[PDB]
Amino acid sequence: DPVSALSNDCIKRSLPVAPNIVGNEIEFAYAMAIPNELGKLSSAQVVSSIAGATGTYFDPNSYYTNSSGQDIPVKVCSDSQTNGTTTVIDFTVDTCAATLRYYYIIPEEARGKDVQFSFSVKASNGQVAEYKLGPYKISKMDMAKNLSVTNDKCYLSFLNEGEAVHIYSKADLQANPSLAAKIDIMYAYSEKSDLSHAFYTSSSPKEYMGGTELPSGFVNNTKMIKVYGLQDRQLSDLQYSKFIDDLDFETIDMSKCTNYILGLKEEAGAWVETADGKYRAYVYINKASASEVTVSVKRYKM
Amino acid sequence: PVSALSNDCIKRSLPVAPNIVGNEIEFAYAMAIPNELGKLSSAQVVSSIAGATGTYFDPNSYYTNSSGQDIPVKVCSDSQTNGTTTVIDFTVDTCAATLRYYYIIPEEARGKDVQFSFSVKASNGQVAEYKLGPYKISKMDMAKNLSVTNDKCYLSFLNEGEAVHIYSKADLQANPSLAAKIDIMYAYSEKSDLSHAFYTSSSPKEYMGGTELPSGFVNNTKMIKVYGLQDRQLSDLQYSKFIDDLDFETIDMSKCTNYILGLKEEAGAWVETADGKYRAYVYINKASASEVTVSVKRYKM
């Protein structure tokens, strides 16, 4: 026999190796079952230990599996409601068994902390069940994906709050020359393909800059280590990848660093440490053509 | 890869099980549409001979868990049948469902074939359809779980549409003409050699333990006692044993008798009425000193 009463089970769908980054979701599959002759499912709830950001919800579909292992969503609930730590959803369709997906959107206040979860269910015979998961570690990292870099949109800052990188333009600096003090890296493309796509910093040698000039006020001397083919599954969305996590930032050796990088291209990368040692980052080149580069960045505050 | 509304249907009733008037033919009708394109709107079945009252689609879709057990999810409102057509509407959004349809076999289908056309509509305007049959309907009649007692003791296999009818002693006192319709008289004796017995016009006195036939009981029914034929439709047990029309046509009644003693649970009897008009199988569902429960399949020769 299986459980002769309301029962439950819950599995984290998000991968154990994948770091839990602010702004991203942690996804759970919460299964409930009651013998059909005893009653039907009434409601489900999750209480998180730190209130989720806006967008934390239960999807109202139960996901049943066909013979081929593919999902069949059936809309068995009304919309979820979240107040602070607690998300509740009501069944509006009679069923004895369902699996609902819960999405916790990681809030700024969880950065660097642990979060745990208590899932629970009610059925129409007055029975209840409960299932706890966690704690789970939330990363200190920030991440920004698929940002556009061009000869005009060329000034990378790793110093803004909550922003792994920000790309300032030449227009931004003409308007607000003070922004030059926040700039860590200047991108330039040269048609000499010994220079090609380049990252420069305050002390880059004039010899390797192919005519590019730093704006006045660009005084940060950023440390950089050029890499190729170091892929991160979150930054590149290509599978069988590994993940850069907090410990990798803590333990990267920045001794053998340089003050310029030449020949960037798709899949190239750069480990970065800002002038004052305040932040480290990894800049990944998703794509690069003569007229545009796309970058994605993880940043970690030391 | 499904790229459009699609369907499939399987008959769930077993091929070996005869399709008998009053009973159901059950079908599992599966439908699916890619979820991004829309959702299931409605399902319909048209039978070639209008089903009897009770023909319906169960409003639950049956999904299967990992353990292979059904999960019923109430995704439709009640079905409606008008004549040959049963229609049911989805009231819950889904891209895939399996609904069970039950066709209750009407009298007018007896000895004929019945076929089926299933169809589905989705919210993108697409349709799909699937045909099954024809399926043969039996000529048999079946009556289950009838009460036989020392007073409710006169079995007639002669009534229209009724596999067996149990007349009582009070029935015969009120309507003496009923004796002419009686094929078998049941009696229980406390002599363990006789026990629960069936008798007929020529049963020998010596095996009747003092039971007497009423006057007018003139039919000499042919009988053969059977062991080990727990017909599934008559018994609701697990044995995969089914008496069908051909078995009645071809059963050898040469070595018959005119009485049966020691009836008990799971025993049975092949019967041919005096005029050869009907053959039957009487199954003993259970027996106590005070009451026998019988179920009967009858076939008109």
PDB file of C-alpha atoms in Angstrom, chain A residues 5-186:
ATOM      1  CA  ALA A   5      -3.626   9.432   4.334  1.00  0.00           C
ATOM      2  CA  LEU A   6      -2.540  12.814   2.886  1.00  0.00           C
ATOM      3  CA  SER A   7       1.134  12.736   2.151  1.00  0.00           C
ATOM      4  CA  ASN A   8       3.787  15.012   0.579  1.00  0.00           C
ATOM      5  CA  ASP A   9       7.310  15.166  -0.817  1.00  0.00           C
ATOM      6  CA  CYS A  10       9.365  18.037  -2.203  1.00  0.00           C
ATOM      7  CA  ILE A  11      12.452  18.162  -4.443  1.00  0.00           C
ATOM      8  CA  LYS A  12      14.645  21.164  -5.233  1.00  0.00           C
ATOM      9  CA  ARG A  13      14.783  21.325  -9.055  1.00  0.00           C
ATOM     10  CA  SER A  14      17.604  23.855  -9.163  1.00  0.00           C
ATOM     11  CA  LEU A  15      20.983  22.042  -9.369  1.00  0.00           C
ATOM     12  CA  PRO A  16      23.106  21.610  -6.144  1.00  0.00           C
ATOM     13  CA  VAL A  17      26.257  22.844  -7.929  1.00  0.00           C
ATOM     14  CA  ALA A  18      24.504  25.964  -9.275  1.00  0.00           C
ATOM     15  CA  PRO A  19      25.076  28.953  -7.011  1.00  0.00           C
ATOM     16  CA  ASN A  20      21.963  30.723  -5.711  1.00  0.00           C
ATOM     17  CA  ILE A  21      22.390  34.373  -6.851  1.00  0.00           C
ATOM     18  CA  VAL A  22      20.230  37.375  -5.840  1.00  0.00           C
ATOM     19  CA  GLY A  23      17.546  38.144  -8.417  1.00  0.00           C
ATOM     20  CA  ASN A  24      17.440  34.492  -9.637  1.00  0.00           C
ATOM     21  CA  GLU A  25      14.939  31.823  -8.717  1.00  0.00           C
ATOM     22  CA  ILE A  26      15.238  28.665  -6.609  1.00  0.00           C
ATOM     23  CA  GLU A  27      12.713  26.217  -8.041  1.00  0.00           C
ATOM     24  CA  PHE A  28      11.021  23.401  -6.128  1.00  0.00           C
ATOM     25  CA  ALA A  29       8.584  20.602  -7.185  1.00  0.00           C
ATOM     26  CA  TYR A  30       6.125  19.956  -4.320  1.00  0.00           C
ATOM     27  CA  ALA A  31       4.207  16.633  -4.653  1.00  0.00           C
ATOM     28  CA  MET A  32       1.032  15.879  -2.691  1.00  0.00           C
ATOM     29  CA  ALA A  33      -1.242  12.790  -2.650  1.00  0.00           C
ATOM     30  CA  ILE A  34      -4.296  11.555  -0.792  1.00  0.00           C
ATOM     31  CA  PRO A  35      -6.105   8.309  -1.455  1.00  0.00           C
ATOM     32  CA  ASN A  36      -8.968   9.339  -3.763  1.00  0.00           C
ATOM     33  CA  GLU A  37     -11.695   7.713  -1.682  1.00  0.00           C
ATOM     34  CA  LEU A  38     -10.669   9.727   1.455  1.00  0.00           C
ATOM     35  CA  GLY A  39     -10.922  13.177  -0.118  1.00  0.00           C
ATOM     36  CA  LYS A  40      -9.217  15.724  -2.364  1.00  0.00           C
ATOM     37  CA  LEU A  41      -6.419  18.289  -2.201  1.00  0.00           C
ATOM     38  CA  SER A  42      -7.568  21.755  -0.820  1.00  0.00           C
ATOM     39  CA  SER A  43      -4.528  24.058  -0.579  1.00  0.00           C
ATOM     40  CA  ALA A  44      -0.733  24.268  -0.462  1.00  0.00           C
ATOM     41  CA  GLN A  45       1.588  26.695   1.267  1.00  0.00           C
ATOM     42  CA  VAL A  46       5.303  27.522   1.579  1.00  0.00           C
ATOM     43  CA  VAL A  47       6.866  29.614   4.333  1.00  0.00           C
ATOM     44  CA  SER A  48      10.417  30.798   3.509  1.00  0.00           C
ATOM     45  CA  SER A  49      12.835  31.921   6.210  1.00  0.00           C
ATOM     46  CA  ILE A  50      13.538  35.211   4.376  1.00  0.00           C
ATOM     47  CA  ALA A  51      10.680  36.717   2.388  1.00  0.00           C
ATOM     48  CA  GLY A  52      11.083  36.232  -1.335  1.00  0.00           C
ATOM     49  CA  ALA A  53      11.311  39.131  -3.831  1.00  0.00           C
ATOM     50  CA  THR A  54       8.295  40.056  -5.936  1.00  0.00           C
ATOM     51  CA  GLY A  55       7.567  37.245  -8.366  1.00  0.00           C
ATOM     52  CA  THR A  56       7.823  34.490  -5.732  1.00  0.00           C
ATOM     53  CA  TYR A  57       4.844  32.212  -6.554  1.00  0.00           C
ATOM     54  CA  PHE A  58       3.351  28.753  -7.057  1.00  0.00           C
ATOM     55  CA  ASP A  59       2.569  28.096 -10.689  1.00  0.00           C
ATOM     56  CA  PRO A  60      -1.119  27.092 -10.619  1.00  0.00           C
ATOM     57  CA  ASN A  61      -0.642  24.040 -12.895  1.00  0.00           C
ATOM     58  CA  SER A  62      -0.065  20.569 -11.628  1.00  0.00           C
ATOM     59  CA  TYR A  63       2.547  18.857 -13.784  1.00  0.00           C
ATOM     60  CA  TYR A  64       1.565  15.246 -14.464  1.00  0.00           C
ATOM     61  CA  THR A  65       3.936  13.063 -16.570  1.00  0.00           C
ATOM     62  CA  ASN A  66       2.837  11.120 -19.649  1.00  0.00           C
ATOM     63  CA  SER A  67       4.356   7.699 -20.588  1.00  0.00           C
ATOM     64  CA  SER A  68       7.156   9.472 -22.554  1.00  0.00           C
ATOM     65  CA  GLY A  69       8.240  11.394 -19.437  1.00  0.00           C
ATOM     66  CA  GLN A  70       7.021  14.817 -20.780  1.00  0.00           C
ATOM     67  CA  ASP A  71       5.036  17.228 -18.563  1.00  0.00           C
ATOM     68  CA  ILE A  72       1.282  17.655 -18.808  1.00  0.00           C
ATOM     69  CA  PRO A  73       0.282  20.910 -17.094  1.00  0.00           C
ATOM     70  CA  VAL A  74      -3.340  20.914 -15.819  1.00  0.00           C
ATOM     71  CA  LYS A  75      -4.580  24.188 -14.275  1.00  0.00           C
ATOM     72  CA  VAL A  76      -5.908  22.911 -10.972  1.00  0.00           C
ATOM     73  CA  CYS A  77      -5.407  25.976  -8.786  1.00  0.00           C
ATOM     74  CA  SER A  78      -6.334  29.608  -8.641  1.00  0.00           C
ATOM     75  CA  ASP A  79      -3.428  32.100  -8.592  1.00  0.00           C
ATOM     76  CA  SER A  80      -1.061  32.008  -5.631  1.00  0.00           C
ATOM     77  CA  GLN A  81      -0.877  34.784  -3.129  1.00  0.00           C
ATOM     78  CA  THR A  82       2.311  35.732  -1.281  1.00  0.00           C
ATOM     79  CA  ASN A  83       2.414  37.853   1.822  1.00  0.00           C
ATOM     80  CA  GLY A  84       5.997  38.304   3.150  1.00  0.00           C
ATOM     81  CA  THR A  85       7.375  34.837   3.848  1.00  0.00           C
ATOM     82  CA  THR A  86       4.172  32.916   3.042  1.00  0.00           C
ATOM     83  CA  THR A  87       2.852  31.802  -0.327  1.00  0.00           C
ATOM     84  CA  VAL A  88      -0.564  30.086  -0.425  1.00  0.00           C
ATOM     85  CA  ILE A  89      -2.433  28.542  -3.306  1.00  0.00           C
ATOM     86  CA  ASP A  90      -5.961  26.986  -3.374  1.00  0.00           C
ATOM     87  CA  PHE A  91      -7.062  24.059  -5.455  1.00  0.00           C
ATOM     88  CA  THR A  92     -10.211  24.852  -7.489  1.00  0.00           C
ATOM     89  CA  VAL A  93     -10.252  21.429  -9.278  1.00  0.00           C
ATOM     90  CA  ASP A  94     -10.947  18.097  -7.623  1.00  0.00           C
ATOM     91  CA  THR A  95      -7.856  15.956  -7.540  1.00  0.00           C
ATOM     92  CA  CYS A  96      -6.230  13.451  -5.245  1.00  0.00           C
ATOM     93  CA  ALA A  97      -2.650  14.071  -6.431  1.00  0.00           C
ATOM     94  CA  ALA A  98      -0.677  17.005  -7.800  1.00  0.00           C
ATOM     95  CA  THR A  99       2.828  18.385  -8.222  1.00  0.00           C
ATOM     96  CA  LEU A 100       3.127  22.120  -8.068  1.00  0.00           C
ATOM     97  CA  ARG A 101       6.207  24.180  -8.867  1.00  0.00           C
ATOM     98  CA  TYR A 102       7.232  26.902  -6.445  1.00  0.00           C
ATOM     99  CA  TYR A 103       9.591  29.679  -7.489  1.00  0.00           C
ATOM    100  CA  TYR A 104      11.408  31.636  -4.796  1.00  0.00           C
ATOM    101  CA  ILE A 105      12.957  34.847  -6.212  1.00  0.00           C
ATOM    102  CA  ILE A 106      16.126  35.450  -4.115  1.00  0.00           C
ATOM    103  CA  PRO A 107      15.845  38.893  -2.462  1.00  0.00           C
ATOM    104  CA  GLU A 108      18.708  41.350  -1.773  1.00  0.00           C
ATOM    105  CA  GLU A 109      18.279  40.761   1.955  1.00  0.00           C
ATOM    106  CA  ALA A 110      19.218  37.034   1.485  1.00  0.00           C
ATOM    107  CA  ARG A 111      22.687  37.908  -0.008  1.00  0.00           C
ATOM    108  CA  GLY A 112      25.337  35.822   1.670  1.00  0.00           C
ATOM    109  CA  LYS A 113      22.784  34.164   4.041  1.00  0.00           C
ATOM    110  CA  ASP A 114      21.029  30.786   4.269  1.00  0.00           C
ATOM    111  CA  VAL A 115      17.345  30.302   3.353  1.00  0.00           C
ATOM    112  CA  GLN A 116      15.096  27.397   4.366  1.00  0.00           C
ATOM    113  CA  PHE A 117      11.598  26.382   3.454  1.00  0.00           C
ATOM    114  CA  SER A 118       8.556  24.748   5.057  1.00  0.00           C
ATOM    115  CA  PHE A 119       6.018  23.355   2.556  1.00  0.00           C
ATOM    116  CA  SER A 120       2.562  22.204   3.697  1.00  0.00           C
ATOM    117  CA  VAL A 121      -0.706  20.899   2.315  1.00  0.00           C
ATOM    118  CA  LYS A 122      -4.367  20.549   3.417  1.00  0.00           C
ATOM    119  CA  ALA A 123      -6.962  18.022   2.102  1.00  0.00           C
ATOM    120  CA  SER A 124     -10.780  17.964   2.278  1.00  0.00           C
ATOM    121  CA  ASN A 125     -10.876  15.345   5.088  1.00  0.00           C
ATOM    122  CA  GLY A 126      -9.145  17.843   7.412  1.00  0.00           C
ATOM    123  CA  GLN A 127      -5.820  16.054   7.146  1.00  0.00           C
ATOM    124  CA  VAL A 128      -2.559  18.089   6.836  1.00  0.00           C
ATOM    125  CA  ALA A 129       1.103  17.247   5.817  1.00  0.00           C
ATOM    126  CA  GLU A 130       4.397  19.155   5.929  1.00  0.00           C
ATOM    127  CA  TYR A 131       7.865  18.947   4.376  1.00  0.00           C
ATOM    128  CA  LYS A 132      11.004  21.033   5.124  1.00  0.00           C
ATOM    129  CA  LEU A 133      13.934  21.725   2.812  1.00  0.00           C
ATOM    130  CA  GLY A 134      17.221  23.577   3.343  1.00  0.00           C
ATOM    131  CA  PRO A 135      18.999  25.532   4.491  1.00  0.00           C
ATOM    132  CA  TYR A 136      20.435  26.606   1.227  1.00  0.00           C
ATOM    133  CA  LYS A 137      23.406  29.028   0.843  1.00  0.00           C
ATOM    134  CA  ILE A 138      22.800  32.274  -1.078  1.00  0.00           C
ATOM    135  CA  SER A 139      25.881  33.587  -2.877  1.00  0.00           C
ATOM    136  CA  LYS A 140      27.449  37.052  -2.290  1.00  0.00           C
ATOM    137  CA  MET A 141      27.859  37.419  -6.022  1.00  0.00           C
ATOM    138  CA  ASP A 142      26.217  39.827  -8.413  1.00  0.00           C
ATOM    139  CA  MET A 143      25.631  38.869 -12.007  1.00  0.00           C
ATOM    140  CA  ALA A 144      24.787  40.918 -15.166  1.00  0.00           C
ATOM    141  CA  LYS A 145      24.223  39.138 -18.486  1.00  0.00           C
ATOM    142  CA  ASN A 146      24.290  40.002 -22.158  1.00  0.00           C
ATOM    143  CA  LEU A 147      25.419  43.595 -21.972  1.00  0.00           C
ATOM    144  CA  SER A 148      26.369  45.508 -25.103  1.00  0.00           C
ATOM    145  CA  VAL A 149      29.831  46.942 -25.524  1.00  0.00           C
ATOM    146  CA  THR A 150      30.916  49.034 -28.485  1.00  0.00           C
ATOM    147  CA  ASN A 151      33.545  51.668 -29.214  1.00  0.00           C
ATOM    148  CA  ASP A 152      31.107  54.265 -27.842  1.00  0.00           C
ATOM    149  CA  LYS A 153      29.670  52.132 -25.065  1.00  0.00           C
ATOM    150  CA  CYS A 154      33.078  51.369 -23.896  1.00  0.00           C
ATOM    151  CA  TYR A 155      33.605  52.216 -20.219  1.00  0.00           C
ATOM    152  CA  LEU A 156      33.147  49.330 -17.815  1.00  0.00           C
ATOM    153  CA  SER A 157      32.562  50.078 -14.092  1.00  0.00           C
ATOM    154  CA  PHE A 158      32.543  47.313 -11.505  1.00  0.00           C
ATOM    155  CA  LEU A 159      31.718  49.797  -8.685  1.00  0.00           C
ATOM    156  CA  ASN A 160      27.998  50.318  -8.738  1.00  0.00           C
ATOM    157  CA  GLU A 161      25.780  48.882  -5.940  1.00  0.00           C
ATOM    158  CA  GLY A 162      23.943  45.729  -6.967  1.00  0.00           C
ATOM    159  CA  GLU A 163      25.339  45.849 -10.523  1.00  0.00           C
ATOM    160  CA  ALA A 164      28.069  43.326 -11.517  1.00  0.00           C
ATOM    161  CA  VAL A 165      29.171  45.734 -14.266  1.00  0.00           C
ATOM    162  CA  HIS A 166      27.803  48.889 -15.812  1.00  0.00           C
ATOM    163  CA  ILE A 167      28.683  50.123 -19.296  1.00  0.00           C
ATOM    164  CA  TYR A 168      28.999  53.916 -19.497  1.00  0.00           C
ATOM    165  CA  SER A 169      29.335  55.602 -22.876  1.00  0.00           C
ATOM    166  CA  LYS A 170      31.265  58.469 -24.262  1.00  0.00           C
ATOM    167  CA  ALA A 171      28.023  60.511 -24.112  1.00  0.00           C
ATOM    168  CA  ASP A 172      27.689  59.674 -20.414  1.00  0.00           C
ATOM    169  CA  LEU A 173      31.143  61.040 -19.762  1.00  0.00           C
ATOM    170  CA  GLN A 174      30.626  64.211 -21.857  1.00  0.00           C
ATOM    171  CA  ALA A 175      27.549  65.031 -19.715  1.00  0.00           C
ATOM    172  CA  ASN A 176      29.095  63.965 -16.400  1.00  0.00           C
ATOM    173  CA  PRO A 177      32.818  63.982 -16.583  1.00  0.00           C
ATOM    174  CA  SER A 178      33.000  62.726 -12.951  1.00  0.00           C
ATOM    175  CA  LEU A 179      31.908  59.260 -14.130  1.00  0.00           C
ATOM    176  CA  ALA A 180      35.523  58.747 -15.387  1.00  0.00           C
ATOM    177  CA  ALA A 181      36.567  58.116 -11.727  1.00  0.00           C
ATOM    178  CA  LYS A 182      34.251  55.000 -11.602  1.00  0.00           C
ATOM    179  CA  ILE A 183      35.716  53.464 -14.786  1.00  0.00           C
ATOM    180  CA  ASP A 184      37.782  50.330 -14.355  1.00  0.00           C
ATOM    181  CA  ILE A 185      38.259  49.198 -17.956  1.00  0.00           C
ATOM    182  CA  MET A 186      38.070  50.887 -21.338  1.00  0.00           C
TER     183      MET A 186
END
